[PDB]
Amino acid sequence: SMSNEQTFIAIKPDGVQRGLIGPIISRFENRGFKLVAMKLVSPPQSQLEQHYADLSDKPFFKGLVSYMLSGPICAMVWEGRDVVKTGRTILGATNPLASAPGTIRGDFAIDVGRNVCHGSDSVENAKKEIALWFKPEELISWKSATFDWVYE
Amino acid sequence: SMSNEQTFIAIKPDGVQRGLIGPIISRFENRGFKLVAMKLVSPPQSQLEQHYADLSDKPFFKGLVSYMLSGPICAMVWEGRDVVKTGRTILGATNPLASAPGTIRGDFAIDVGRNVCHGSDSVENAKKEIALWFKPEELISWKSATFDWVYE
Amino acid sequence: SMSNEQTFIAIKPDGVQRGLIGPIISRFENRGFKLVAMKLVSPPQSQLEQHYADLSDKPFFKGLVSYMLSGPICAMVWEGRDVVKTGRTILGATNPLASAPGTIRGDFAIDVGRNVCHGSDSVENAKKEIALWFKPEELISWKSATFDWVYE
Amino acid sequence: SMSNEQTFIAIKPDGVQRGLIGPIISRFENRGFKLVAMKLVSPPQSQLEQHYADLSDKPFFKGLVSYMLSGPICAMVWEGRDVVKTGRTILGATNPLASAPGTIRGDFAIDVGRNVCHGSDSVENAKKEIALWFKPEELISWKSATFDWVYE
Amino acid sequence: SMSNEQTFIAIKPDGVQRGLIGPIISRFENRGFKLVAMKLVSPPQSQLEQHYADLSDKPFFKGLVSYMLSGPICAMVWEGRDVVKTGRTILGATNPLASAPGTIRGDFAIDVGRNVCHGSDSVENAKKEIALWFKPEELISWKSATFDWVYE
Amino acid sequence: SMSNEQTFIAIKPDGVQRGLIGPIISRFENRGFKLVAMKLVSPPQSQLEQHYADLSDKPFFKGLVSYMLSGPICAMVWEGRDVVKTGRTILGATNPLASAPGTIRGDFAIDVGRNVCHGSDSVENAKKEIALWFKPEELISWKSATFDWVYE
Ligand SMILES: Nc1ncnc2c1ncn2[C@@H]1O[C@H](COP(=O)(O)OP(=O)(O)O)[C@@H](O)[C@H]1O
Ligand SMILES: Nc1ncnc2c1ncn2[C@@H]1O[C@H](COP(=O)(O)OP(=O)(O)O)[C@@H](O)[C@H]1O
Ligand SMILES: Nc1ncnc2c1ncn2[C@@H]1O[C@H](COP(=O)(O)OP(=O)(O)O)[C@@H](O)[C@H]1O
Ligand SMILES: Nc1ncnc2c1ncn2[C@@H]1O[C@H](COP(=O)(O)OP(=O)(O)O)[C@@H](O)[C@H]1O
Ligand SMILES: Nc1ncnc2c1ncn2[C@@H]1O[C@H](COP(=O)(O)OP(=O)(O)O)[C@@H](O)[C@H]1O
Ligand SMILES: Nc1ncnc2c1ncn2[C@@H]1O[C@H](COP(=O)(O)OP(=O)(O)O)[C@@H](O)[C@H]1O
């Protein structure tokens, strides 16, 4: 689609505690995507329950929210062509037992409840998650010096 | 299912000769598995033949045994949930021709007779290999400081 | 001194454009320091002139401010024992021509006007830079799961 | 099947511009393949048109040749068993959207027109591409010290 | 001066706990030194007190032995020309505050009591430490395939 | 001073044999220097003797020449401000015993007769070595997409 597509990527509290902030950012950075927003944050419980509002009936919802509250979160917005779908491919399968080596979860995660990172699963959910986690002023506008070498 | 499942991972003499001990250990270390036993050994021929007992009448058996005798072996025991199956996924296909990049054999190996590493193919074979290569006191009991961040 | 000492580290616009956000964060992360605040920001010219207010009489001041405005900045606050002095050691000499390999500038920078990163040179300047760049609510409070293994 | 098979790998101008010469070479070097020829060249227009002669009727042909002329190319010849097929697997799918993480394009590329690298798709085309890009005297004959550890 | 010199390198419990076994081994492996013995052990109290016998009058002696007992240790014997002196340089200064980036402690450690690794400080002390931590049968004799390329 | 200063960097046969082409290129590539010429060559004895002409009556001259003939050499020309002096700093001390970790020889070499790489010691010697190893048309003229972010 368009090279200005954006997605929401968040390093979960287990990824921060295990020192994976650098490696995870390098995966998207080396792929050619543009970081337009990033901040370390500890959101309230109500925001995390809204982020996972589609899973409010799951049995693991209560444990998921409390685990997302157990530490800081590195919330990011990455911009690039097909960055939503490609971003999920970089993260790996939701259950890292089903993820392939070379992906984030395939290299670092074991339990589905401790899968290190989060990524938007659709363009519409990406826009809803970006507006939920970031203010419009936190989206930084700039052009990469190698844009014409990453994109045709 | 059980987070205390154990598998036997061994760096074959070609992996030792090519300076791959560090990177191979980092594959399991960065994934979140616990190293409970490790030693550099040059095991006798009988132990290696007992290790590959199910392949005694294979055409490549004699060559496999002498090649496993041609250099030191880094024998390891890794502990973690589904470490047996996931460990095999980390190693890649037995023939690195069929292995995917991002795995150990997919990044370092070419020939099936020089596939760099070994991994237990099942839980029962893992217990038999662990008892064959390691004495019980050589398995170290300890608790990882990030156990609760790797497992839910 | 105290293990709660904080310093201000910022990835300059040249470091962001060249894709060094991941590697730089990994230097402090692998050393054992705790990231307590981080955000991607494009500060106004007045804030950057206050950040370098001690150099308002330098001939390179006008070019320094405009260069700091040419792209986004990854502003960070790292916490750890002697993190101010050790942080400068990790960055390297101000002129990367005088920096040693293994440091950030020793591995990535050439020109002093394009030295990729910034670091506070004293505890007092660190407190002034932290309050200048970050709001008090952006400092996230948490304890690393390996704190007792990094510190005695 | 034979260990003396050769393929032509070429780092495209976008790969050179984005500082990927080192990492791409390490992918084949760490796998066990032998570098027998390499040079940084800026070939004439007629050479690139012959390289993609089978795509002369494609609508993107003129733009492909023009973009391949816009910068230097790191032309290489790698030798090893099944190096053509395995080399293609290391590069990843032609469209980086379909490429897997762990491959070259899966880690570094996004656009099909900016897939940073090229590899021969067959042994016949490899010989034709090697004869087109290299003089026979530029292929260096040597024996790797770890040959007997890579191959059985 | 002789290439058969041996030193004792030991990854301390904090190094094991922080997932640094792989990276530390790669430091010596990539330099050209040969691993002739390695094991993951949890030594008794009397062995650690003999290891630091020269520091029995230090005030931090009791705490040092207790902390060295609090987790597993990766005991290693590396062989190479001037491996004792060069090994100390690779580890870095005893106090990580004085260590340089690029060394093990300069990249991973902060506290003197948590410097993640140990190395023999002399050839005489290396022989004493090797005889204390390893049985003679645990030192594997082999010839590196790149020996004639590491040494003249 | 001049950003178009050029130096001659060559990977010696031991560096090629030990699979160090990728990492060595990344040292100069990540620092921000521009690769303008590169080729894998097996130069004749006379060229190598002319390269080390100032050492003709040294005791190690004959051994140095035959060792430089024993394998392929990756000859390169790198361009950048103070690339000659900084390039030598990246390589480390001639005797890797005296070299610091973080440099090429400090991370990969042990013996002075096997110090992996070569670098021009002065600007005038660089011009003489570049003309000795490379034809003028083999030097590629191009502009890095991040030139204005590496240099002020
Ligand atoms: N069975 C489970 N047990 C515990 N946690 C789970 C389970 N399934 C999903 N989760 C957690 O809930 C989050 C939401 O998962 P979901 O949105 O369905 O997939 P994804 O987050 O990969 O798009 C996941 O990131 C995962 O950490
Ligand atoms: N056709 C073959 N030729 C040579 N060696 C082989 C062949 N098949 C298997 N081997 C070697 O024998 C070992 C045992 O193979 P097997 O146990 O069947 O696969 P895995 O090691 O993946 O469990 C392999 O690691 C491989 O190195
Ligand atoms: N001579 C110079 N020319 C251009 N820019 C300079 C020069 N000296 C310093 N700078 C820039 O001004 C910034 C402030 O430098 P200074 O505060 O003196 O050292 P540091 O920032 O390393 O503590 C530096 O980060 C550098 O990028
Ligand atoms: N639809 C397209 N649009 C733009 N460029 C393309 C397209 N398809 C292929 N190319 C370019 O043409 C080159 C030749 O493609 P092809 O030979 O079919 O794939 P491969 O290079 O993987 O063998 C590719 O490397 C790619 O950069
Ligand atoms: N002042 C101190 N406080 C706490 N621990 C110390 C102190 N000095 C040394 N140690 C510990 O004792 C060990 C032995 O120190 P020493 O042998 O003098 O240095 P090295 O281990 O570099 O040879 C060190 O590894 C260090 O962990
Ligand atoms: N004493 C020695 N013994 C063996 N080889 C040596 C010795 N001194 C130098 N050499 C080799 O000769 C080459 C030329 O040395 P020299 O030019 O003086 O240092 P540099 O290569 O750092 O400029 C070195 O790269 C080294 O490999």
CSV table of N, CA, C and O in Angstrom, one decimal, chain A residues 1-61:
chain,number,residue,atom,x,y,z
A,1,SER,N,0.8,-1.2,0.0
A,1,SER,CA,0.0,0.0,0.0
A,1,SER,C,0.9,1.3,0.0
A,1,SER,O,1.8,1.4,-0.8
A,2,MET,N,0.6,2.2,0.9
A,2,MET,CA,1.3,3.4,1.0
A,2,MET,C,2.5,3.3,2.0
A,2,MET,O,2.4,2.5,3.0
A,3,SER,N,3.6,4.0,1.7
A,3,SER,CA,4.8,3.9,2.5
A,3,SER,C,4.6,4.7,3.8
A,3,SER,O,5.5,4.6,4.7
A,4,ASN,N,3.5,5.4,4.0
A,4,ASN,CA,3.2,6.2,5.2
A,4,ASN,C,2.4,5.4,6.2
A,4,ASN,O,1.9,6.0,7.2
A,5,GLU,N,2.2,4.1,6.0
A,5,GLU,CA,1.4,3.3,6.9
A,5,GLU,C,2.1,3.2,8.2
A,5,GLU,O,3.3,3.1,8.3
A,6,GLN,N,1.3,3.3,9.3
A,6,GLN,CA,1.8,3.3,10.7
A,6,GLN,C,1.2,2.1,11.5
A,6,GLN,O,0.1,1.7,11.2
A,7,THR,N,2.0,1.6,12.4
A,7,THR,CA,1.6,0.6,13.3
A,7,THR,C,2.1,0.9,14.7
A,7,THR,O,3.0,1.7,14.9
A,8,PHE,N,1.5,0.2,15.7
A,8,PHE,CA,1.8,0.4,17.1
A,8,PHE,C,2.6,-0.8,17.6
A,8,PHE,O,2.0,-1.9,17.6
A,9,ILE,N,3.8,-0.6,18.0
A,9,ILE,CA,4.7,-1.7,18.6
A,9,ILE,C,5.0,-1.3,20.0
A,9,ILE,O,5.4,-0.2,20.2
A,10,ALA,N,4.8,-2.2,20.9
A,10,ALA,CA,5.1,-2.0,22.3
A,10,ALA,C,5.9,-3.1,22.9
A,10,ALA,O,5.6,-4.3,22.7
A,11,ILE,N,7.0,-2.8,23.6
A,11,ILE,CA,7.8,-3.7,24.3
A,11,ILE,C,7.2,-3.9,25.7
A,11,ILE,O,7.1,-3.0,26.5
A,12,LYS,N,6.7,-5.2,25.9
A,12,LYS,CA,6.0,-5.5,27.2
A,12,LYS,C,6.9,-5.5,28.4
A,12,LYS,O,8.1,-5.5,28.2
A,13,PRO,N,6.4,-5.4,29.6
A,13,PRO,CA,7.2,-5.3,30.8
A,13,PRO,C,8.3,-6.4,30.9
A,13,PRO,O,9.3,-6.2,31.5
A,14,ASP,N,8.0,-7.6,30.4
A,14,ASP,CA,9.0,-8.7,30.4
A,14,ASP,C,10.1,-8.4,29.4
A,14,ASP,O,11.3,-8.8,29.7
A,15,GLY,N,9.8,-7.8,28.3
A,15,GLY,CA,10.9,-7.4,27.4
A,15,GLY,C,11.8,-6.3,27.9
A,15,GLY,O,13.0,-6.3,27.6
A,16,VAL,N,11.2,-5.4,28.7
A,16,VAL,CA,12.1,-4.3,29.3
A,16,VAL,C,12.9,-4.9,30.4
A,16,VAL,O,14.1,-4.6,30.6
A,17,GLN,N,12.3,-5.8,31.3
A,17,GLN,CA,13.1,-6.4,32.4
A,17,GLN,C,14.2,-7.2,31.9
A,17,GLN,O,15.3,-7.3,32.6
A,18,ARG,N,14.1,-7.9,30.8
A,18,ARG,CA,15.1,-8.8,30.3
A,18,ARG,C,16.1,-8.1,29.4
A,18,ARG,O,17.0,-8.8,28.8
A,19,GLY,N,16.0,-6.8,29.3
A,19,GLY,CA,17.0,-6.0,28.5
A,19,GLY,C,17.0,-6.2,27.0
A,19,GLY,O,18.0,-6.4,26.4
A,20,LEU,N,15.7,-6.2,26.4
A,20,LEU,CA,15.5,-6.4,25.0
A,20,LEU,C,15.1,-5.2,24.3
A,20,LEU,O,14.6,-5.3,23.1
A,21,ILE,N,15.2,-4.0,24.9
A,21,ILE,CA,14.8,-2.8,24.2
A,21,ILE,C,15.6,-2.5,23.0
A,21,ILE,O,15.1,-2.2,21.9
A,22,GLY,N,17.0,-2.6,23.1
A,22,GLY,CA,17.9,-2.4,22.0
A,22,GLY,C,17.7,-3.3,20.9
A,22,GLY,O,17.5,-2.9,19.7
A,23,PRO,N,17.7,-4.6,21.2
A,23,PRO,CA,17.6,-5.6,20.1
A,23,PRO,C,16.2,-5.5,19.3
A,23,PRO,O,16.2,-5.6,18.1
A,24,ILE,N,15.1,-5.2,20.1
A,24,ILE,CA,13.8,-5.1,19.4
A,24,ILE,C,13.8,-3.9,18.5
A,24,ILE,O,13.3,-4.0,17.3
A,25,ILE,N,14.2,-2.8,19.0
A,25,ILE,CA,14.3,-1.6,18.1
A,25,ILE,C,15.1,-1.8,16.9
A,25,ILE,O,14.8,-1.3,15.8
A,26,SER,N,16.2,-2.6,17.1
A,26,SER,CA,17.1,-2.8,15.9
A,26,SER,C,16.4,-3.6,14.8
A,26,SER,O,16.8,-3.5,13.7
A,27,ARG,N,15.5,-4.5,15.2
A,27,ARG,CA,14.8,-5.3,14.2
A,27,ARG,C,14.1,-4.4,13.2
A,27,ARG,O,14.2,-4.6,12.0
A,28,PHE,N,13.3,-3.5,13.7
A,28,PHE,CA,12.5,-2.6,12.9
A,28,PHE,C,13.5,-1.6,12.2
A,28,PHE,O,13.3,-1.2,11.0
A,29,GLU,N,14.5,-1.1,12.9
A,29,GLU,CA,15.4,-0.1,12.4
A,29,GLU,C,16.2,-0.6,11.2
A,29,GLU,O,16.3,0.0,10.2
A,30,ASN,N,16.7,-1.9,11.4
A,30,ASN,CA,17.5,-2.5,10.3
A,30,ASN,C,16.6,-2.9,9.1
A,30,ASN,O,17.1,-3.0,8.0
A,31,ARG,N,15.3,-3.1,9.3
A,31,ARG,CA,14.4,-3.5,8.2
A,31,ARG,C,14.2,-2.3,7.3
A,31,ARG,O,13.9,-2.5,6.1
A,32,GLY,N,14.3,-1.1,7.8
A,32,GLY,CA,14.0,0.1,7.0
A,32,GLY,C,12.8,0.9,7.4
A,32,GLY,O,12.5,1.9,6.8
A,33,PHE,N,12.1,0.5,8.5
A,33,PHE,CA,11.0,1.3,9.0
A,33,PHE,C,11.4,2.5,9.8
A,33,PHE,O,12.5,2.6,10.3
A,34,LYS,N,10.6,3.5,9.8
A,34,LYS,CA,10.9,4.8,10.4
A,34,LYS,C,10.2,4.9,11.8
A,34,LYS,O,8.9,4.7,11.8
A,35,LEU,N,10.9,5.2,12.8
A,35,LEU,CA,10.4,5.4,14.1
A,35,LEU,C,9.9,6.9,14.2
A,35,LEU,O,10.7,7.8,14.1
A,36,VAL,N,8.6,7.1,14.4
A,36,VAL,CA,8.0,8.4,14.4
A,36,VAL,C,7.5,8.8,15.8
A,36,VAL,O,7.2,9.9,16.1
A,37,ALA,N,7.4,7.8,16.7
A,37,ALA,CA,7.0,8.1,18.1
A,37,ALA,C,7.5,7.0,19.0
A,37,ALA,O,7.4,5.8,18.6
A,38,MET,N,8.0,7.4,20.2
A,38,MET,CA,8.4,6.4,21.2
A,38,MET,C,8.5,7.1,22.5
A,38,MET,O,8.8,8.2,22.6
A,39,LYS,N,8.1,6.3,23.5
A,39,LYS,CA,8.1,6.8,24.9
A,39,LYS,C,8.0,5.6,25.9
A,39,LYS,O,7.3,4.7,25.6
A,40,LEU,N,8.8,5.7,27.0
A,40,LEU,CA,8.7,4.8,28.1
A,40,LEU,C,7.6,5.2,29.0
A,40,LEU,O,7.6,6.4,29.5
A,41,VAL,N,6.6,4.4,29.3
A,41,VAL,CA,5.4,4.8,30.0
A,41,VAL,C,4.9,3.6,30.8
A,41,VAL,O,5.2,2.4,30.6
A,42,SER,N,4.2,3.9,31.9
A,42,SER,CA,3.5,2.9,32.8
A,42,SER,C,2.1,3.3,32.8
A,42,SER,O,1.6,4.0,33.7
A,43,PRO,N,1.3,2.8,31.8
A,43,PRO,CA,-0.1,3.3,31.7
A,43,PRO,C,-1.0,2.8,32.8
A,43,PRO,O,-0.7,1.8,33.5
A,44,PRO,N,-2.1,3.5,33.1
A,44,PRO,CA,-3.0,3.0,34.1
A,44,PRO,C,-3.7,1.7,33.6
A,44,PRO,O,-3.7,1.3,32.5
A,45,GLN,N,-4.4,1.1,34.6
A,45,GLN,CA,-5.0,-0.2,34.3
A,45,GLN,C,-6.2,0.0,33.4
A,45,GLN,O,-6.5,-0.9,32.5
A,46,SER,N,-6.9,1.2,33.4
A,46,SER,CA,-8.0,1.4,32.5
A,46,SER,C,-7.6,1.5,31.1
A,46,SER,O,-8.3,1.1,30.2
A,47,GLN,N,-6.4,2.1,30.8
A,47,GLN,CA,-5.9,2.2,29.5
A,47,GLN,C,-5.5,0.8,28.9
A,47,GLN,O,-5.8,0.5,27.8
A,48,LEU,N,-4.9,-0.1,29.7
A,48,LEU,CA,-4.5,-1.4,29.3
A,48,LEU,C,-5.8,-2.3,29.1
A,48,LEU,O,-5.8,-3.1,28.2
A,49,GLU,N,-6.8,-2.0,29.9
A,49,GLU,CA,-8.1,-2.8,29.7
A,49,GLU,C,-8.8,-2.3,28.4
A,49,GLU,O,-9.5,-3.1,27.8
A,50,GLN,N,-8.6,-1.1,28.0
A,50,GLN,CA,-9.1,-0.6,26.7
A,50,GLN,C,-8.3,-1.1,25.6
A,50,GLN,O,-8.8,-1.4,24.5
A,51,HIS,N,-7.0,-1.2,25.8
A,51,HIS,CA,-6.1,-1.8,24.7
A,51,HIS,C,-6.5,-3.2,24.4
A,51,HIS,O,-6.5,-3.6,23.2
A,52,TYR,N,-6.8,-4.0,25.4
A,52,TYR,CA,-7.2,-5.4,25.2
A,52,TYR,C,-8.7,-5.5,25.5
A,52,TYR,O,-9.2,-6.5,26.0
A,53,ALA,N,-9.5,-4.5,25.1
A,53,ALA,CA,-11.0,-4.6,25.3
A,53,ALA,C,-11.6,-5.7,24.5
A,53,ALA,O,-12.6,-6.3,25.0
A,54,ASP,N,-11.1,-6.1,23.4
A,54,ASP,CA,-11.6,-7.2,22.6
A,54,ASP,C,-11.4,-8.6,23.2
A,54,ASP,O,-12.0,-9.5,22.8
A,55,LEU,N,-10.6,-8.6,24.3
A,55,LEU,CA,-10.4,-9.9,25.0
A,55,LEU,C,-10.8,-9.9,26.4
A,55,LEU,O,-10.3,-10.6,27.3
A,56,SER,N,-11.9,-9.0,26.7
A,56,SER,CA,-12.4,-8.9,28.1
A,56,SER,C,-13.0,-10.2,28.6
A,56,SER,O,-13.2,-10.3,29.8
A,57,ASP,N,-13.5,-11.1,27.7
A,57,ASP,CA,-14.1,-12.3,28.1
A,57,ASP,C,-13.2,-13.5,28.2
A,57,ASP,O,-13.6,-14.6,28.6
A,58,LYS,N,-11.9,-13.3,27.8
A,58,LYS,CA,-10.9,-14.4,27.9
A,58,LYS,C,-10.6,-14.7,29.3
A,58,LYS,O,-10.6,-13.8,30.2
A,59,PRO,N,-10.3,-16.0,29.6
A,59,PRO,CA,-10.0,-16.3,31.0
A,59,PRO,C,-8.6,-15.8,31.4
A,59,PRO,O,-8.4,-15.6,32.6
A,60,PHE,N,-7.7,-15.4,30.5
A,60,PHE,CA,-6.4,-14.9,30.8
A,60,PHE,C,-6.4,-13.4,30.8
A,60,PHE,O,-5.3,-12.8,30.9
A,61,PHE,N,-7.6,-12.7,30.8
A,61,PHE,CA,-7.6,-11.3,30.7
A,61,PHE,C,-7.1,-10.6,32.0
A,61,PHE,O,-6.3,-9.7,32.0
